[PDB]
Amino acid sequence: SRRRVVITGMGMLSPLGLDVPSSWEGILAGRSGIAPIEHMDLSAYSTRFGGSVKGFNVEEYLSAKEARKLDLFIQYGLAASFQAVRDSGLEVTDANRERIGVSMGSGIGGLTNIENNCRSLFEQGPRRISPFFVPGSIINMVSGFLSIHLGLQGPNYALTTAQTTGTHSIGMAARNIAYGEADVMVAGGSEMAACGLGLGGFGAARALSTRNDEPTRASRPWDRDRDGFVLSDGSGALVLEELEHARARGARIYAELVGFGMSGDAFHMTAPPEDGAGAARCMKNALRDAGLDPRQVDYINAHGTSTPAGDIAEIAAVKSVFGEHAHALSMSSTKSMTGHLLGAAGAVEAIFSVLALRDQVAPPTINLDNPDEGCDLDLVAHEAKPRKIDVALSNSFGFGGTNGTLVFRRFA
Amino acid sequence: SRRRVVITGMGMLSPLGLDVPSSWEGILAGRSGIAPIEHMDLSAYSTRFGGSVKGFNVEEYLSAKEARKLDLFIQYGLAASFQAVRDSGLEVTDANRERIGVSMGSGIGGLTNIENNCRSLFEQGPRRISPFFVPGSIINMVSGFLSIHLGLQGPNYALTTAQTTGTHSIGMAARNIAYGEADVMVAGGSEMAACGLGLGGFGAARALSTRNDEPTRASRPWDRDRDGFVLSDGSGALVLEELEHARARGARIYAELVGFGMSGDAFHMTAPPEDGAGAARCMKNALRDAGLDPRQVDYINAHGTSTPAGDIAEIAAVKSVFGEHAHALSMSSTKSMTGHLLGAAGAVEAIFSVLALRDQVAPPTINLDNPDEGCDLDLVAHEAKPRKIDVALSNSFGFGGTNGTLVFRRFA
Ligand SMILES: COC(=O)CNC(=O)c1cc(C)on1
């Protein structure tokens, strides 16, 4: 019968810091991680900024010999996973290694690696493709390389549900532990899609903010002047642990994961329905999964991408689900500061939702200067709001109409 | 407790045919689907052959205009899925659409699309990249497009576990139903990695057979002259259904899915351990999951990729799990005929395992002319072997040492 699941470790690379505490300090101070991109020439692109990871040192984590074989999204995933395991205090042994697995996902995976090997193939021929091209680029290799380096013999897999990946990875990892398939899971996601194909591809769809002259003001969820999402890089990992297993080893418990929802919009390949019908179905699934009254929800870490249709759909979903309580809860988009980490968005936002519970503070939605028509909830505009938070919800919505919701609450 | 899960519809594209019955007919006749790859200049490549899907008509499923938006791997996944749903006779309604989900995966995803768009990008800059590049290339769009087309509002996700994708997709979809998160799932995988990038990538790792003179003899699992795997394209989909839901509407039930195991080798990025310790833990996990004794297994559809170390690891794992019964069961690699469909391998091989149960025949391992040292099991060399099969295993062992096993049983 269904076991309880708690968070005992977290790890992060974001546009705001090389770990969780540095990233969280940025979140609470309303600081932007968005800047003109330096690692390539974007003069021919309509968008030339994003959330880069600044000063990442892979030799904190991996031999330069192993790192050279791996796409940045895999390096980023391994870094956040290592931080999370270290933070958990968990010791891997012959007695428990079969009961510890990993589910680290990505939306796009090794697009930089694939681009560069495509350049080699076309200009110089197949004999110049890296021998490490496949294992260094495919999405399951965060799970793979993490299991090899730590000796994790539990369930080993990877989700790819575009901008929902991080949320789905965490939720399904919790189900693994809930149903007895594992006692410990490392789950989250990683993304580094800032290459010609990434910025060019989202650019071709006209999905990106083109605010090149004021990059820090680009991501403005629910603001009347929003013009698309900001593309950002990084990783979130959490150590999920069966409750009694955590208690037995004296673990520090950040929070309990009580609810997970999924739903499909079945509406459009890329556009959310205007009324947030799918987001609403997903949140209700997650709240029934948690055995909660919707009035218990204090804080929502919104998907809040800063797209016209996305932001309004979320307001409509929240008002539909929560009715009058919609005006009492606090809802914010940390994407206002981090931009959109795509497959990693749900992973870092789950960590922010947990730290919201730890510190009893709603992160701000920065740049919310002129809330749009009907965006009249507490969106924690401009500045972090200390407040009572017992239950925190983290939402993600992606291409293919894929929805995920995680429900966390304080553990005593 | 846990609900029972049955297979009520199947769909496939393979190197042997454009549906299940034509593919199965080739399997039972020992036909090869391997041939030199056409409409592609492979002169500079060390491998020039593979399993292509021959005569595929996407307009049987989609308008030309919607097809143009989607990578071949998504077209193939949609074709198998549409087939499987049609085969099931399921009627989607407002009363059940929230209870019907999708988990169709891919190991490598949109290589062909990435290749064609790199060309535009490098030659003409980012403004020639297709607007549909991202939604048309990401692995979750088979699940996405299927859900939108059929109005499926159930769990919507996609796995990517390299060569284990199809096995994990089906297993985790079976869990969704067993644990009451859905009544129906469409699950499996699809792959189209015969671009330069796939043939070049695996080729740079020296993972592929280079037997260009005799492509039909290249895939020779457990034969002493094997020189690596053969790259193949296609898709498999199964309609998974709760037993009582299937019975109530009078569905034709092919077989029951009684077991699913997962494990990680935690050994090497690309190679299995010599003794197949990981594959052994995974098969034991699947049999424990099914409540079955190893002696009850009659038929194993091996991973059997025709790599030196992969094939010998699976023999060691089968002898270790089954001891004095390892010689009584039959184990074959249909990859002798189909080649290795990577993320689709587990989906098409689960269908072959279900059809082994329906028709009471073990498919052959063709090309097994000279079994290698220790390869002394009943590997169904050369020709199909009619026999009693109450219980069939399907194994997948992928990059990152990720393992999956499905256990199917006759239903009456
Ligand atoms: C149309 O009104 C709503 O959707 C809000 N009503 C709920 O049913 C709801 C369900 C759960 C769980 O939390 N809120």
Question: A169 alpha carbon to ligand 1 midpoint, in Å?
Answer: 25
Residues A165, A231 within the same domain: yes
CA angle B162, B241, B397 (to 5 degrees): 20
Q: Is the CB of A151 inside 8 Å of chain B's CB atoms?
A: yes
Specified resolution (Å): 1.8
The identity of residue A29, as a single letter, is A
Residues B50, B172 within the same domain: yes
Residues B102, B243 within the same domain: yes
Report the C-alpha gap between A42 and A10 in whole angstroms: 34
- With CB atoms and an 8 Å threshold, state whether B201 touches A133: yes
Structural biology method used? X-ray
Residues A117, A193 within the same domain: yes
Q: Is the CB of B197 inside 8 Å of chain A's CB atoms?
A: yes
Q: Is the distance from the beta carbon of residue A288 to the nearest atom of ligand 1 less than 6 Å?
A: yes
Q: Which of A398, A405, A401 is nearest to A162 (CA)?
A: A398
Is A48 within a domain? yes
Report the C-alpha gap between A404 and A286 in whole angstroms: 8
Domain termination residue (choose one: A259, A292, A322) = A259
Q: Is the CB of A168 inside 8 Å of chain B's CB atoms?
A: yes
Q: How far is B265 from chain A (nearest CA, A)?
A: 6
Domain termination residue (choose one: A207, A242, A259) = A259
Residue B403's domain spans which residues?
Answer: 260-412
Is A337 within a domain? yes
Task: State the pairing for strand pair B156-157/B100-105.
Answer: parallel
Is A143 within a domain? yes
Q: Is the CB of B371 inside 8 Å of chain A's CB atoms?
A: no
- With CB atoms and an 8 Å threshold, state whether B107 touches A278: no
Is B310 within a domain? yes
Q: Which of A6, A1, A2 is nearest to A243 (CA)?
A: A6
Residues A132, A15 within the same domain: yes
Tokens standing for A345? 């968005």
Residues B268, B400 within the same domain: yes
Q: Is the CB of B179 inside 8 Å of chain A's CB atoms?
A: yes
Residues A264, A248 within the same domain: no
DSSP class of A183: S
Which residues on chain B are in Cβ contact (under 8 Å) with A158?
A: 159-161
Which residues on chain A are in Cβ contact (under 8 Å) with B105?
A: 160
| Cβ–Cβ < 8 Å for A315, A372 | no
3-state SS track over chain B: CCCCEEEEEEEEEECCECCHHHHHHHHHCCCCCEEECCCCCCCCCCCCEEECCCCCCHHHCCCHHHHCCCCHHHHHHHHHHHHHHHHHCCCCCCCCHHHEEEEEECCCCCHHHHHHHHHHHHHHCHHHCCCCCCCCCCCCHHHHHHHHHHCCCCCEECECCHHHHHHHHHHHHHHHHHCCCCCEEEEEEEECCCCHHHHHHHHHCCCECCCCCCHHHCCCCCECCCCCECEECEEEEEEEEEHHHHHHCCCCCCEEEEEEEEEECCCCCCCCCCCCHHHHHHHHHHHHHHCCCHHHCCEEECCCCCCHHHHHHHHHHHHHHHHHHCCCCEEECCHHHHCECHHHHHHHHHHHHHHHHHHCEECCECCCCCECCCCCCCCCECCCEECCCCEEEEEEEECCCEEEEEEEECCC
Domain termination residue (choose one: A209, A243, A259) = A259
Q: Which of A251, A269, A273 is nearest to A317 (CA)?
A: A273
Q: Which of B121, B157, B162 lies closest to A262 in CB terms? A: B157
Quick check: helix, strand or coil at residue A7? Answer: strand
Residues B312, B222 within the same domain: no
Residues B204, B311 within the same domain: no
- With CB atoms and an 8 Å threshold, state whether B401 touches A147: yes
| Cβ–Cβ < 8 Å for B227, B210 | yes
Q: Is the distance from the beta carbon of residue A295 to the nearest atom of ligand 1 less than 6 Å?
A: no
Residues A132, A167 within the same domain: yes
Q: Which of A258, A281, A321, A329 to mutate to test the pocket of ligand 1 (most atoms within 8 A of CB)?
A: A321
- With CB atoms and an 8 Å threshold, state whether A133 touches B197: yes
- φ, ψ dihedrals at A410, nearest 5°: -55, 140
First to last CA, chain A: 22
Domain count within chain B: 2
Q: Is the CB of A345 inside 8 Å of chain B's CB atoms?
A: no
Q: Is the distance from the beta carbon of residue A287 to the nearest atom of ligand 1 less than 6 Å?
A: yes
Report the C-alpha gap between A37 and A109 in whole angstroms: 19
Report the C-alpha gap between B406 and A123 in whole angstroms: 44
Which residues on chain B are in Cβ contact (under 8 Å) with A45?
A: 126
Is A130 within a domain? yes
By residue count, chain B amounts to: 412
Q: Is the CB of A200 inside 8 Å of chain B's CB atoms?
A: yes
- With CB atoms and an 8 Å threshold, state whether A181 touches B262: yes
| Cβ–Cβ < 8 Å for A404, A171 | yes
Q: Is the distance from the beta carbon of residue A296 to the nearest atom of ligand 1 less than 6 Å?
A: no
Which residues on chain A are in Cβ contact (under 8 Å) with B125?
A: 44
Is A1 within a domain? no
Quick check: helix, strand or coil at residue A198? Answer: helix
Q: Whose CA is nearest to atom 12 of ligand 1?
A: A284
Query: How buried is B55 (Cβ within 10 angstroms: 0-12 exposed, 13-18 middle, 19+ buried)?
Result: exposed
Residues B39, B188 within the same domain: yes
Q: Chain A, 208-267: which have a CB under 8 Å from a chain B CB?
A: 262-267
Residues A253, A333 within the same domain: no
Q: Whose CA is nearest to atom 11 of ligand 1?
A: A284
